[PDB]
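Quick illustration, no need to memorize.
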Amino acid sequence: VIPTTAPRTVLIYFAGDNSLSGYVSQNLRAIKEGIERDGLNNGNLLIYTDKQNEAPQLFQLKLEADTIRQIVLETYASNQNSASTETLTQIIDKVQKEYPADSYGLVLWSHGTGWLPSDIYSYLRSNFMEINDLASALSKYHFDFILFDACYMSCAEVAYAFRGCADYIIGSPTEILANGFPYQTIMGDMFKKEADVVGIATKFYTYYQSEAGTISVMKSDELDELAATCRTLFHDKTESDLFAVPVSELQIMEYLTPNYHALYDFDDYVSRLATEEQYNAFKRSMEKAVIYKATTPKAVYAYPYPYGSYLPVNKYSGLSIYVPQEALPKLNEWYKDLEWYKDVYQ
């Protein structure tokens, strides 16, 4: 018999209650198999779900003898809105209070449009994870990692917005469809004394290696330098300068609609605007900030239902970026409220 404190408490928060509830169940199956395969290094694993035809609930999963024990802690009223950041921080507070640990991690599962505005389709002339409210809500915490099991979250704008509340950010610059992350192989990595964020991303790549998927890991204390380096090439560009960049030449990252796209490869975009000197500086900053990245030959997209699309990843920096475009004035104006824009474009 040995005394020990928990090296980490991790909350996996499924913002479900939609067409994708089946996927929450599949992921819960993968998580239970992963705990049974790895154990949890004395850590605590808490799950929040809000499935359709089910009340929202917070429960612990733990290993007991040779098997999983689910302990349904709280069952919430059904007027609890799980896509609300107030709900998210209510749950985080409860977990931290009842499961204190040497450190914390957060997995946010939400398949949809990621951080882009609710009106995104409208803005492209054709949201729980709205970047400013979410970053504001989480800014009072400190996580060792946030794993975004969501589309398009590996972009400069998100990595920058969350730099203060997480040491590392794990996500995809493109879509993650179906179940999402391979929970059945990453559970032990989340609970090492230091979270093995590179392990987690390498497992995502290994799982999807014969199919399609993109992953990256950002080191948050390198993001201030990345923004400063980008500031040197963006802060003197007029709207007319920006609009002269031809997106038809750029590596696509986002593909929700067939005519206008918001997000493209970060490095590719910057290479159209930077001087040689600025571009070399940018590459050095990216080498420090993006500590792991991997991609298959193609990226997979939901559009068009129900077959979807596979598009070639010919350039891959591990980060997507918004590209301002003359044809997207409402999206350009929305963009002006992001912290990245204010600090980098000014």
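DSSP finds 13 helices and 13 strands in the chain.
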